[PDB]
Amino acid sequence: HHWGYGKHNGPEHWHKDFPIAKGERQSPVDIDTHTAKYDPSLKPLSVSYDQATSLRILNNGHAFNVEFDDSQDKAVLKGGPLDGTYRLIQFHFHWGSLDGQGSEHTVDKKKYAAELHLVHWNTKYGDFGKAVQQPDGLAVLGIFLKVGSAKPGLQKVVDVLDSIKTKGKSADFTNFDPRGLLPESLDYWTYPGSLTHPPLLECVTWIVLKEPISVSSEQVLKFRKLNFNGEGEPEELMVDNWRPAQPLKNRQIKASFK
Ligand code: MMC
Ligand SMILES: [Zn+2]
């Protein structure tokens, strides 16, 4: 029927409706740290989130998205492997039913408790919808979440989750600063990939940060209380909304460090 993360509509079934699922540049992948090539030509990342304008938080049925105003160069990503400016449109997470799983990318087969994705689109294309028709249309910054100490900057998000429990619900969510979700270091791995959920479009340049952020058990716990289902429907907890690692194929992962 329509795609999800269950037994009957899960990742293994996506290819039926979205044949690119078996494409040549699918994401996520396992990052093999000993086979990743250090590239000294890689420039440092430039994250300018000082002028970020968050607007709303939404449960879309597969995750919760925090949305930002992208009508101007307010919160952008540039540098690293990118050419041009990329504006932040939204961020969301992928998590598991247990602490031992939840991330999409893996590092030497290690899975984290969750993974944050800050989605950006290439301003040369004018809008999001056109950027997804290009091979260099999007840039996604991926950050790993491990369970440990609480992340202060994540608390405002955790707290509004009750008001967007079910699919389709949304809440006003202004003045949220995403600078609070970045680790100390900006060292990364980069490779050409795709969106990790349908439509699985191969428009992404992935930037995966080496350093994870810590969140408390209680913070991850509140994520696990969301619902995939709409209000008034039988309850299905939003957990395991992650896609397994795909074959690297004809690709090379580059490292900005050694
Ligand atoms: C090609 Hg997107
Ligand atoms: Zn994602």
- As a three-state string, the secondary structure of 149-208 is CCCHHHHHHHHHHHHHCCCCCEEECCCCCHHHHCCCCCCEEEEEECCCCCCCCCCEEEEE
Q: How far apart, in whole angstroms, are the C-alpha atoms of residue 257 and residue 36?
A: 10
One-letter amino acid for residue 37 of the chain:
K
Q: Is the dihedral of CA 207, 212, 215, 221 positive or negative?
A: positive
* Residue 125 three-state SS: helix
Write phi, then psi, for 28 (nearest 5 degrees).
Answer: -80, 180
The token pair at 202 is 């191969």
First to last CA, the chain: 46
Q: How far is the CA of 196 from the centre of ligand 2 (A)?
A: 6
Q: Are 257 and 187 in contact (CB under 8 A)?
A: yes
Closest atom of ligand 1 to CA, residue 132: 2
Report the separation in Å between the CA atom of 161 and the middle of ligand 1, taken as the mean of its atom positions. 33
- Residue 203 Cα: closest atom of ligand 1: 2
How many CA atoms lie within 13 Å of 13's alpha carbon, on the beta-carbon side?
10
Are 204 and 27 spatial neighbours (Cβ–Cβ below 8 Å)? yes
Q: For 86-149, list the strands marked E by DSSP.
A: 86-95, 106-107, 114-122, 138-147
Chain-centroid distance, C-alpha 147 = 18
Walk me through the domains of the chain, giving residue ranges and CATH numbers: 1-258 (3.10.200.10)
Question: Which ligand 1 atom is the nearest neighbour of the CA of 135?
Answer: 1
Cα–ligand 2 centroid distance for 221 (angstroms): 19
Experimental method: X-ray
| CA–CA dist 145, 128 (Å, integer) | 27
Q: Which atom of ligand 1 is nearest to the CA of 202?
A: 2
Alpha helix segments (H runs only) across the chain: 128-131, 155-160, 217-223
User: How far apart are alpha carbons 59 and 41 in whole angstroms?
Assistant: 40
Residues catalogued as catalytic:
62
Centroid of ligand 2 to alpha carbon of 242 (angstroms): 8
Return the number of other C-beta atoms located less than 10 Å from residue 241's C-beta: 24
Q: State this model's resolution in angstroms.
A: 1.9
Ligand 1: residues with CB < 6 A are: 132-135, 137, 201-203
